[PDB]
Amino acid sequence: FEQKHLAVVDAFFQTYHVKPDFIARSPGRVNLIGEHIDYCDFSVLPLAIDVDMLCAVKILDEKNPSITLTNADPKFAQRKFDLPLDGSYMAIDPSVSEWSNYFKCGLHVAHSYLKKIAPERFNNTPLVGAQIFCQSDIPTGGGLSSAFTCAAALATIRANMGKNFDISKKDLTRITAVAEHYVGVNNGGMDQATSVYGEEDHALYVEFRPKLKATPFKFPQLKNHEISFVIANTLVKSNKAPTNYNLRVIEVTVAANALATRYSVALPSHKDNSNSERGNLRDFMDAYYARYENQAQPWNGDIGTGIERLLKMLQLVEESFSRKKSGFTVHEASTALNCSREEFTRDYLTTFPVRFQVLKLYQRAKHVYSESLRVLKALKMMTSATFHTDEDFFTDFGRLMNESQASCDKLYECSCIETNQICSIALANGSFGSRLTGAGWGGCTIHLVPSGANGNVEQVRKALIEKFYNVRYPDLTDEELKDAIIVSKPALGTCLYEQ
Amino acid sequence: FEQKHLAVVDAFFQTYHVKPDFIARSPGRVNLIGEHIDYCDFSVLPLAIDVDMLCAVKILDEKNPSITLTNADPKFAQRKFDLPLDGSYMAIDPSVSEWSNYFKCGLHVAHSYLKKIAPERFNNTPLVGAQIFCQSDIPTGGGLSSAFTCAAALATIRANMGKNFDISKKDLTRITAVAEHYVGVNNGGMDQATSVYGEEDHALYVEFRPKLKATPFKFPQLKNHEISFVIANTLVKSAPTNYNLRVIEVTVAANALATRYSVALPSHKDNSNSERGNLRDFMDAYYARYENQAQPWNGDIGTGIERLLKMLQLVEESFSRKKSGFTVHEASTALNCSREEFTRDYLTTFPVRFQVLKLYQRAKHVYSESLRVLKALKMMTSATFHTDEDFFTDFGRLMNESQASCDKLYECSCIETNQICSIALANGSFGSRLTGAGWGGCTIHLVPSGANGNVEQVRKALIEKFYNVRYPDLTDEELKDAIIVSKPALGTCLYEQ
DSSP states (O other): OHHHHHHHHHHHHHHHSSOOSEEEEEEEEEEEEOOSOGGGTOOBEEEEEEEEEEEEEEEOOOSSOEEEEEESSTTSOOEEEEOOTTOOOOOOOSSSOOTTHHHHHHHHHHHHHHHHHOHHHHSSSOOOOEEEEEEEOOOTTSOHHHHHHHHHHHHHHHHHHOTTOOOOHHHHHHHHHTTHHHHTOOSTTHHHHHHHHOOTTEEEEEEOSSSOEEEEEEOOOOSSOEEEEEEEEOOSOTTOOTTTHHHHHHHHHHHHHHHHHHTTOOOOOOSSOOSSSSOOHHHHHHHHHHHHTTSOOOOOSOHHHHHHHHHHHHHHHHHHHGGGTTOBOHHHHHHHTTSOHHHHHHHHSSSSOOOOSSBOHHHHHHHHHHHHHHHHHHHHHHHTOOOSSHHHHHHHHHHHHHHHHHIIIIITOOOOHHHHHHHHHHHHTTOSEEEEESSSSSSEEEEEEEESTTOOHHHHHHHHIIIIIHHHOTTOOHHHHHHHEEEEOOOOOSEEEEO | OOSHHHHHHHHHHHHHSSOOSEEEEEEEEEEEEOOSOGGGTOOBEEEEEEEEEEEEEEEEOOSSOEEEEEESSTTSOOEEEEOOTTSOOOOOOSSOOOTTHHHHHHHHHHHHHHHHHOHHHHSSSOOOEEEEEEEEOOOTTSOHHHHHHHHHHHHHHHHHHOSSOOOOHHHHHHHHHTTHHHHTOOSTTHHHHHHHHOOTTEEEEEEOSSSOEEEEEEOOOOSSOEEEEEEEEOOOOOOTTTHHHHHHHHHHHHHHHHHHTTOOOOOOSSOOSOSSOOHHHHHHHHHHHHSSOOSOOOSOHHHHHHHHHHHHHHHHHHHGGGTTOBOHHHHHHHTTSOHHHHHHHHSSSSOOOOSOBOHHHHHHHHHHHHHHHHHHHHHHHOOOOSSHHHHHHHHHHHHHHHHHIIIIISOOOOHHHHHHHHHHHTTTOSEEEEESSSSSSEEEEEEEESTTOOHHHHHHHHIIIIIHHHOTTOOHHHHHHTEEEEOOOOOSEEEEO
16 A cells, blocks of 8 residues: 555666656556446446556656656566657557557647647647656556556646646546547546546446546445455456457347337437447437436436336336347347348448347346446445445345346356356355456456455455366466455545655 | 369268268359458459368258268268257357358258248248268368358258259348358358359459349450469458457548538448448438439449549548548547547447547548459450450559558558568569458469469469468468469359269
8 A cells, every 4th residue: 555655666766766756646446336338328336446557757857858667567678768849749559569558648648638728838849758667566457558547647747737736537537538549448438537536435436428427435334344345357368259249239239229119219319428329228218218207307327216217127128028038030130120131230230240149139138227227226225225234234235246247147148157156156255246347258356355354355365266266277376366366445546646 | 173073972972871962062252352342332353262162962851850961071070960840940059169050050041041932831840851971172261151151051942942943043142141140250241142153254243232242244265374363371360450440440531521521421221331321422422412413323333433533532632631640639620520429429339449540541442442343343344455464464453552552551461461462473473462351361363374374383482482481380281271273163053963
């Protein structure tokens, strides 16, 4: 925690032989509830975690500004580059796995912000030079790309505007979320918003309509436990199909349109932000309410209205699709959309490769609406629910995580054997709730585990090491094993520490 | 080569101890001109090739119908499955990838077709059983999936409908094109169309607008040379910086053009390889608005050459000062929308990595490459070749111009591709380019064949100067599969025994 902050200052001094002017820090992130619903515009529940990227910076006074980047990790070699004298953006090429790319993204988005607020200073002049020491303990799955981008953007703003300049969380989130198109990631700004808005003891309600937005919600005060989460990687690379993500995108879009057709409503064009180009399952929920519930206004994120309308949606899903759980062939789907096979193929099967015999409209729609509902039930538990013992909190919240896992697996089919093994082991050995998190088909898992003296952290971690990692991956080094399992409480978002 | 049929029938007998009833055959395919333009609805120029899937079949009369599939390759283990007694379709699981998948695809699409023509005959009754020996010499990049699917569909029609009934090429192409979503391939039916409609000495003008359609075009008869093509694999397996980025770039380019010229992109009323308005749609919108040709381009070649030349002028007028590419901010401005709306509409569901969108280069590629297809067809049908070298040169130049476009404008070549082509042209090839998905995969080279041909000159050059260097530890079998030679081939057909 504070130990880490000193280590980075001290290593900066070893490297550059001068005290740094400041440190910029930004935390990793993980999603606690709400998987595979963001591209239907539904809100998710992430948290910032206590692994981070730390960037110690000395600001330079140079005729020709340059930036030097050194990393604590020996495998990431030192980088040095000159800032363009004309004030133009640095050249970045994302056809490389270069460790400094994320810094360059941050530098870039900060630069364009600075050009906006102070044109006469930054339009035709380079930014200031710097010596930078970077140190991260964020493992795979913990969102290094957004943390580094955010720390780098704040460091650039601080270096060029001085310590008495403040950028709001709202602006820092907006400008860094643009970096998704430099990184090759599509979480709609959720990663950046979490790294920026994180607070200790809080998860974030992250929304996308009408705008990317984050609202902190504080976990209940417990009598004598602490809330922690164990995050365990399957070590199956999620990033690595026509049967997976592309297929899901088609299925939920077809589902939204099958519902729209069945209930005779149109999906209104997006007038604001959206994580989809076309009408989606949230749009259907709004269109349905507007027509059948007396000009009901579109859902704008309050918990009570959300719960009521999502429960209604699950009813419409039973009514519309429950007699077709074996899925829809292209022919049956065309009929459900009141269009020809040619129209269907044109609209849904053209751009991206997909592989399927049937489209599982029942399952995919049921997942999205029920998973979106669990986000709201989680919020309700955190805020207004009463628990007569700490155990009741862990049991009820954990049960939502388990119900989420069961849905992701059985309804969305985005789990894998490694995920299920880890979850089962964790639950038999101290976890109250266990689920995949992230892109699915591999990647990370997250576990609700009481921490402290009366907690289960070491019990869960020991069982996972012995029953999963030692079995499936005998040759992992100590370092790899350390990265594979981390323990975290909710953490504070992007910030500066003056030095 | 026609010893194939003998050696397939013999192998069948060695497996099932009985003579087969018929052989169903479907050729592999390759694209000759027209890379990365099909998803903008532009037409391509493929050909069926001298490698094929052969399915020797004995039709079985059984109480409980079963299909046995045996392969000529011993590493593909025999498969046997009973046919669903409720007339249900087989289980084509999408996750498991095994060699019999393409067969089940063909079986499925043929079965569905049969149910529609004779419901009382096929609806709740299984198809007839069979013993089947499958022999393919199609290499990677050659389109085994479509060949095997088409051969299997035809084998299934034949076994169930008798020797006299012949499915139209039209219907066979229609029903097999559907199988793309069972395989996980999205070539808009081009593969199936090529495999079905191939003819000796012909390439195919394969159109997608307003419908999937294939029209054979004969190569010019030459005096003392023969037309052949060397197909050489880079052995690099065919990304947010690649295909995804290209789809976004061409979609944004069409809208920047539509915005610049104040037109709306016409909706799709028939077939299309894109969900949204594309570069072909802009061509139709521009013509309806400024050239009083309210009618969308119908695929006519002369007209097409005219309109594509026009589009290229507009690309220069609209984008030539922005070869640096467009930032997201600049792209939003060119579309007259906010960054939020640009991001929502163009950057949402599929991952991409870019600093700029290269609207000039990508639009220039798609229109110029589509134009090269038409020029190829025009060149093929015109009688202006006084010498054979006139043809090999002029056609080769179109191929070379295409390769340069793919490489520099679309940036979908790779070093292995570029090396292979450079070697080929300096050693007997008249024209050399990548073919297929790009960023690896196969390459195709126009090479005169026969007594006074350069086939062996090119092949030796590639083996000694590319493969032996880059891939020293290639076995003779691998090194053999990497390079094949073909002339245009006949499409799907049956041989009664």
